[PDB]
Design a protein around this ligand. Sequence first.
Ligand SMILES: O=c1ccn([C@H]2C[C@H](O)[C@@H](COP(=O)(O)O)O2)c(=O)[nH]1
Ligand SMILES: O=c1ccn([C@H]2C[C@H](O)[C@@H](COP(=O)(O)O)O2)c(=O)[nH]1
Lengths: 262, 277
Amino acid sequence: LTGELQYLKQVDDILRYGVRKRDRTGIGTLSLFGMQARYNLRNEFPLLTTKRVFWRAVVEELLWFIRGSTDSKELAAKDIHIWGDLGPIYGFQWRHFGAEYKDCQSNYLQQGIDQLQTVIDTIKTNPESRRMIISSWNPKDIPLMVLPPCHTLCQFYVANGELSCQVYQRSGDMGLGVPFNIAGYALLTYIVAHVTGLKTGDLIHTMGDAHIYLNHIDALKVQLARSPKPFPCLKIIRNVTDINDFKWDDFQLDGYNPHPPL
Amino acid sequence: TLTGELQYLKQVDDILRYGVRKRDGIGTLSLFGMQARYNLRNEFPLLTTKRVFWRAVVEELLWFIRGSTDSKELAAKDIHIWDIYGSSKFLNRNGFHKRHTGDLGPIYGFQWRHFGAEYKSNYLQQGIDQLQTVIDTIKTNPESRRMIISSWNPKDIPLMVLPPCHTLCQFYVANGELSCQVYQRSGDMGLGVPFNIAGYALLTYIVAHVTGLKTGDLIHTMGDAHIYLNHIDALKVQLARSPKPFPCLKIIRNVTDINDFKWDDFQLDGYNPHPPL
Ligand SMILES: O=c1ccn([C@H]2C[C@H](O)[C@@H](COP(=O)(O)O)O2)c(=O)[nH]1
Ligand SMILES: O=c1ccn([C@H]2C[C@H](O)[C@@H](COP(=O)(O)O)O2)c(=O)[nH]1
């Protein structure tokens, strides 16, 4: 209903009423189109307690997006291998849109249209805007990527002071990806809400085709067997007025008492 | 679960009850992250609670599909919805004084057919075709999560006379059924929200026609979903009105090309909305 129980029954949606569809690997998936969720960013943070979610990959991948560097090796230095040059990925699109790409050894600042900042600039000036958006979809660059963004874009909305984010994710797996990126885009709200000096209202998670791999069924069926435990509430120690100034040590996650994974 | 126009009205209701007031001097009631499903199987989601302009919906898509950014072409057919923005009083107000009558900017139809083109004339072969790439892909790989048409081009956004309100859609194919989900950043429950529902549900009806598919659903996802404070009193009398059965959209001509589509290829069986007030 209100919480992780949205997601947790999104599995019981696709494991029951889910439709047979095929995966780009060629493995079978159970699919569903057009889901939606609302996760509460006030008083708490939505990190999955049903299965332990990788937190510091969630944190380091983001700051890697805020940097604008598309590379494996930079994040592999954090002992994070989840990702040479991936091409013009989110990190590029966020900070530079419509800028000619060579590789990430080239400096892409000064160029494109920086979305992340243009969202920030617009929040402190225009109290109300529906046009504040970060788009990861550029069909010209896309063929140059190692993979099209599963997260097409986000949009920000402010009412009575509290910031809300909706992220449109065209495709996600319930076992691996969406739990990860739930934290990921709920993480960005906290950040931009911080700079703009606003609060955290809600995170709306919108999914296109949402599947479950036919391996992950029983694994997912073990997970739902577990009563979810109370979400964490996140704190930001150092108050930062720049977006590229955020790093790991400014983050303290309290209240994570997940279950043994897999 | 609702799945109907009953949902749309439930949004209006949940907006009107719980709406938060955001003043632009014209304030509205606003909520965020609304999603509604509209069944496209054996009915057309044309809203019956109040009459939607049909020939406008039909003529805009063709105007979208062929890539037309020119509003004069809709007016010659006496569809005037877009002719305000191509009106000289509007273009010279906003700094478009160098742009001529009917010139809107790169907009949906342009971004659809040519993405990353350079707006001026004849753009054929220029930019990326978002529409023809989806129909080609549905033929080749009906299972893909990568089929999307996005109108957002922040580089070209300032060129646009108005930024795209429906910023992109996605297509999904299963059971020989073609579906669609449009993300709308902003929509007005009283005027334009029901209007797009027709345009995209028609495109799905079109694309399913070209690809040889059926129509599963149209999922309408809204960004800020708002009611201007002045539509309220007039709106709530549309609340007590109970929506009727959806009409029957059909295509009497088998059309192998999406540019070959004409206003004369459809017939609506069973559409009878409520009178005004
Ligand atoms: O945050 C993420 C990132 C990636 N994926 C996976 C799901 C799909 O298997 C795949 C997308 O590949 P395509 O369907 O676009 O080919 O990425 C997720 O589920 N969540
Ligand atoms: O399909 C549409 C097209 C336009 N609008 C109206 C609503 C807003 O008043 C305005 C967009 O406002 P901004 O996003 O530019 O702030 O267009 C809609 O509601 N639905």
